[PDB]
């Protein structure tokens, strides 16, 4: 168990369910603390473990204000320079005594030198109880390694341009951060918000985050940047919607550095019935060639 | 009449000086407190005073972390349905003992029914010490009452070269006890985008000299997404004027249209190491609307 | 001697009552401001006063959103290296005009050099109006100086049934202008875990009556992870006392071991759905240390 805290009114959305960004920030905190503690076991160069990838997060059951969140983490795998961390988020009602599993996630972290930033160090190794666990971890590692290799016109209903949305945010201070960079939590909250906007615009009904499927942090964001979090619908099942979210970082004045793509993610959203079963959502129809390529790649991700 | 706090690390801008948004939020808080207490003075219908206009804010000298901010407020004038409030924000260094006058502003508030909102109620009158005070107040009131009646590939020093925008989804800690959001969140965002546009146009360090006309046209509720767009309007040889507009869109109801929630005019300058305004690059308008806005920027400059 | 602000939605819970943690941080802020101004009065070494002890905080009456808090402070007694500050928190309803005495506290601060931290400096003395004031101050100072020298499967209403803990990574708005964290957030987390254990033991709505001995043993720097652990010590027929302990371990430097940063005693009470205090279930000790802590908590209760 790496983090435990109380959900408060500011942790929720306007409706009263706790924000996806808050759950993501707790997940990141737990994974980062245990990964950082593990990569300084053998007392090497002083390092901090940075989140590089959210392999997957499942929103199994909703969390609400007043409940206590216990988020625990276990180090499954460590590569040459990366560590895989599995994290479980449970909610407990302190009066009712009930405890449910709210979220389940897998993340990837990599240690960065504190002395000379941008320098990756070698993860110390971990000892496994069963060899099948270690090879299954290696298989997942090689799978994720394999996987790694915006204009809007006048909109018609149920088109990509119709739901396409965007947030623009000036990154502020980070005083007590481990490094000079800002945590993935702020950016993930913004990504979740843009995904929710796109889903609600496309489906015109209640919506729920089913899962966040692949969050990649391409490079760090420093203070004084202004980030554009752009969200677009990529592919829809009959009962689910997929949203690509892209985070681009721009220097305000510094033309020494050019605009770059800082992060990318895929959100799977669903709308449920009063009973709690996934209801049919309107189907997205692509119009351009790139939209249809992204729809096909969404179907491929759907069946694999 | 009084509000006072200590400036802390989250209160600062990227530079490490107290954010302009934080100063504006404290000014709004002080004005709202004193006018709300005054508009329930005579024990009428229970009401709350809402900020409607920032007539002007002067950033005289910067404030820094660790200092204590003292914000004082005085009700200058009362109309039939509005209150004019003058506000001073002073900084106090608790170690050196030094105290500077950091900002000076005057605001306009309107009391709104708590029982039946959207109903504007009648401000109780204030008694003036001299008749000249009330006459100057009426003059200022009538002045403010009268005055209220897409970027392609850019070339440098144009409006399009500096034009920028922030987009924000209004969440739950932006709003008050009711669904409306404080003027503070919006003013902080306007200041941020104005600073962005000014830094893009002038390519050096800059500082807000004054905030000229913040008008709050309509309320913003939770669940809206607001676009705070900033563009440069007119430049002196040593000063720049930035227009900031707040547009609010309903996310889900496409029956409902986008509306203009707030508008303001920012004056930015770039200063020397000594502290004197240095020449800023000149804005050249390209379209007809750009120079129309440049011409009224010159008009505002000469008055 | 004074700080005042208006309470906003983030300072309160869903019901509209201000969190105890926010009141505690405001008390700390006011005390620190005046302690810092006094310990730089006569132009010694440039220093800032850090909160070391909360002698007691009484929650006399609740404060709610929209009311403005006026926090006043007075320097009661100063030792060789510490300053005693008494603080009153008053709430003002700006509509009804009513003002209540909400909370009253006594705190201890110690000046630390800004140039070389960990260096304690000598508090300048204060001149008393009556000799009895200084004599009572010396008595209280010597009293406080004297005073400073695992849950298995549980059965209901024992210590293990209620014992709880929070785990927190020091985040971005927790710290001061320097690497240390304000006492306010730490006290807020202590109040939260005390409320958690109290609600687990009492199965009702509950409220903090008073917090008695908050000691800040050592500072917490950025990059620590703190465990705020709370366990029940002794229960009256209508009151509960909860001991809260704050332990900090460094995440990155594994060279350093766990250390005890803070400790406090919270007394909680149980309310009805109407709002009347109901009798609380009696805590039963099982071990020898549990019964020692129950008896010494009773001793603290009878004082
Ligand atoms: C993570 C980061 C350091 C990657 O470094 P890099 O420039 O790609 O250098 P590398 O040569 O180490 O890249 C490959 C290796 O890095 C790690 N890595 C990089 N990207 C990864 C990804 N999407 N998923 C998992 N591991 C990744 C792995 O260690 C990978 O393979 P390995 O097993 O051979 O070590 C860099 O992209 C980054 O910092 N992104 C921003 C993360 C951030 O947000 N930081 C602020 C706080 S969250
Ligand atoms: C300002 C607001 C109340 C205007 O009210 P309205 O519905 O247009 O009603 P009216 O225009 O007929 O006028 C009512 C009074 O308000 C005054 N008023 C309205 N807008 C004003 C402005 N920008 N500046 C100065 N006075 C203004 C009017 O002068 C009038 O009083 P008067 O007769 O003494 O002149 C409305 O825009 C609003 O609700 N703004 C709130 C924005 C916000 O976020 N505030 C802080 C958080 S709630
Ligand atoms: C308070 C602190 C400076 C104590 O310093 P120290 O290393 O123990 O050195 P000493 O205690 O000998 O310093 C002497 C003074 O400190 C006072 N002091 C220390 N702890 C105290 C406490 N809990 N209550 C009251 N006084 C205390 C002593 O009474 C003494 O005063 P005196 O000499 O006039 O009698 C240290 O414990 C600390 O820093 N705690 C954390 C405070 C913090 O978190 N600051 C950041 C903002 S909250």
Curated annotation (Swiss-Prot), chains B, C:
Residue stretches of biased makeup (Basic and acidic residues): 289-299
Active site residues of this protein: 13, 191
Functional pathway: Lipid metabolism; fatty acid metabolism
Disulfide linkage: none
Tissue-by-tissue expression: Widely expressed with highest levels in brain. High levels also found in thymus, large intestine and testis. Negligible in muscle and adipose tissue. In the central and peripheral nervous systems, displays a predominantly neuronal localization with highest expression in cell bodies and neurites.
Induction statement: Up-Regulated in activated macrophages.
All copies of domain HotDog ACOT-type, residue ranges: 6-115, 160-274
Source domain of life: Eukaryota
E.C. no: 3.1.2.2
GO biological process entries: fatty acid catabolic process
GO CC term, one of those recorded: cytoplasm
GO molecular function, one term: identical protein binding
Coiled coil: none
Annotated keywords: Acetylation, Cytoplasm, Fatty acid metabolism, Hydrolase, Lipid metabolism, Repeat, Serine esterase
Described purpose of this protein according to its UniProt entry: Catalyzes the hydrolysis of acyl-CoAs into free fatty acids and coenzyme A (CoASH), regulating their respective intracellular levels. Preferentially hydrolyzes palmitoyl-CoA, but has a broad specificity acting on other fatty acyl-CoAs with chain-lengths of C8-C18. May play an important physiological function in brain.
Protein's UniProt name: Cytosolic acyl coenzyme A thioester hydrolase
Organism whose genome encodes this protein: Mus musculus
Protein encoded by which gene: Acot7
Full-protein residues shown: 60 to 368 of 381
